[PDB]
Amino acid sequence: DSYLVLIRITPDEDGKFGFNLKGGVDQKMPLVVSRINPESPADTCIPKLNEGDQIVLINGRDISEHTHDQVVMFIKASRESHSRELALVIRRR
Amino acid sequence: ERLQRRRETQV
Ligand code: NA
């Protein structure tokens, strides 16, 4: 069955976390990690992000009715925080 | 009913 994982990523020097996103309310699909860049922040945090993970919470925010572009905005905005850390709750099988 | 090509974004 599915389970949740809390993933905390700090972006690299170029402001990148190292993963690709698909999905959003306008895409008729959940938010899904479509690619992990090997050895990037998303690939080397503990626990690490995985391809196929479904993102359900972004820095405490429920994203179930947000568009792809709105979600991308939320992720980039994590880089302006006090620590500039992205905290994802994802769902995995 | 219909489905456009889905966007993918690198972050
Ligand atoms: Na969504």
Contacts of B3 in chain A (CB under 8 A): 28
Residue of chain B whose Cα is closest to the Cα of A35:
B10
A28 touches chain B (CB under 8 A): yes
**How does DSSP assign A19-50, residue by residue?**
EEEEEEGGGTEEEEEEEE-TTSHHHHSSSPP-
Please list, in sequence order, all residues whose beta carbon lies within 8 angstroms of the beta carbon of residue A8, skipping any fewer than 6 positions away: A45, A85, A86, A87, A88
- C-alpha dist (Å) from residue A37 to A5, A6, A27, A42, A59: 19, 19, 23, 8, 21
A10 touches chain B (CB under 8 A): no
Cβ-contact A87, A41 below 8 angstroms: no
- C-alpha dist (Å) from residue B10 to A2, A4, A26, A43, B4: 25, 23, 18, 14, 19
Amino acid A72 reads V
* Beta carbons of B7 and A27 less than 8 Å apart: yes
Q: Give the residue numbers spanning the domain of A3.
A: 1-93
Helix (H) or strand (E) holding A68: helix A68-78
> In total, how many domains does chain A have?
1
3-state secondary structure of A74: helix
CA pair distance A51, A32, nearest whole angstrom: 8
Please list, in sequence order, all residues whose beta carbon lies within 8 angstroms of the beta carbon of residue A66, skipping any fewer than 6 positions away: A24, A25, A74
* Beta carbons of A21 and B3 less than 8 Å apart: no
The token pair at A47 is 């626990």
Cβ-contact A42, A12 below 8 angstroms: no
